[PDB]
Write a sequence for this structure.
């Protein structure tokens, strides 16, 4: 009997798959695709991960914050705002497909958001392109969750990607926010909004411009709410990440190196409490002598069965 965080490649397999994904404490990666950046000056503000998708997944990351730009009427490139990340969306999809084959009792939650203006030559909306060339593309048949449950369990989603829709209104009908209203997302804020035709209450802390100390308080205030809430119809998404700023090199990495351990320590002190889904920069990046945020999120899940 070892800690779940001792097997991060297949920790969701150790859970009771009757759980709703909402009741699982899931580590996510912010701006997941940005691991390919090498330029040092650009990486200060634009790079948020050093591991690739398969290595994030092996370290136990199950929520991926994929940001896209429409490069052609049939193509979505992964971006951080203006910055091209050097791979297209099919790349993440192939990695997830492969990972889910090898670890069939895990599920992956994929947040999809438009992060920059489409190429000139594009004539289609980003949502249409995603819908027709990825979600409904026969090439990724069976890969996505296509159920009609607004609050799906681990059993119904494992081995599949569940869409977390940050595209706005969509004609896709499966996954979080998959309706023609989409998710009302407040800018730089802690907020709450109903999604899936009012079936779920989404509670978000996404104050991405906060400085160190304010950010930690914002993450801790939403952690304290999740701890008292056992309602499976509430979903918590808590971003520990922040935009860079302070000196020429107060990078996203520097913020993560302070935020991650502090929040990791707090979750460890809390024991088995519900945390929600915590989305972090530099997932899996450890520092000698400090607690590891991804491991602490994983271990905060209480087993009983
Ligand atoms: O860069 C910010 C930050 O990455 C937030 O986490 C994301 O929710 C915002 O929409 C984005 O503009
Ligand atoms: O990915 C990182 C990186 O390789 C660091 O150099 C190492 O010191 C960390 O502990 C590791 O988590």
């Amino acid at each position: 009997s070892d800690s779940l965080s001792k097997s991060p490649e297949n920790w969701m397999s150790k859970l009771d798959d009757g759980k709703h994904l909402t009741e699982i404490n899931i580590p996510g990666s912010h701006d997941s695709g940005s691991f390919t950046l090498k330029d040092p000056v650009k990486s200060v503000w634009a790079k948020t991960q050093d591991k690739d998708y398969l290595t994030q997944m092996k370290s136990g990351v199950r929520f991926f914050d994929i940001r896209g730009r429409a490069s052609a009427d049939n193509m979505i490139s992964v971006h951080h705002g203006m910055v091209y990340l050097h791979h297209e969306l099919g790349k993440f999809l192939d990695d997830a497909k492969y990972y889910l084959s090898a670890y069939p009792n895990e599920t992956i939650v994929m947040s999809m958001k438009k992060d920059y203006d489409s190429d000139s030559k594009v004539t289609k909306t980003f949502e249409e392109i995603f819908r027709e060339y990825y979600y409904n593309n026969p090439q990724y048949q069976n890969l996505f969750y296509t159920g009609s449950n607004a609050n799906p369990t681990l059993k119904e989603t494992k081995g599949k990607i569940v869409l977390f829709n940050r595209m706005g209104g969509t004609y896709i009908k499966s996954g979080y926010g998959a309706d023609t209203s989409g998710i009302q997302w407040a800018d730089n804020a802690t907020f709450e909004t109903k999604i899936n035709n009012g079936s779920l209450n989404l509670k978000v802390q996404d104050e991405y411009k906060d400085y160190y100390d304010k950010k930690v308080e914002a993450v801790k205030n939403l952690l304290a709410k999740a701890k008292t809430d056992s309602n499976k119809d509430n979903v918590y998404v808590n971003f520990l990440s922040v935009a860079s700023g302070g000196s020429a090199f107060n990078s996203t990495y520097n913020y993560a190196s302070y935020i991650n351990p502090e929040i990791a320590k707090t979750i460890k002190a809390n024991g088995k409490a519900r945390t929600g889904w915590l989305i972090v920069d530099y997932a899996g990046y450890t520092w000698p002598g400090y607690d590891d945020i991804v491991s602490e999120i994983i271990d905060s899940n209480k087993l009983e069965h």
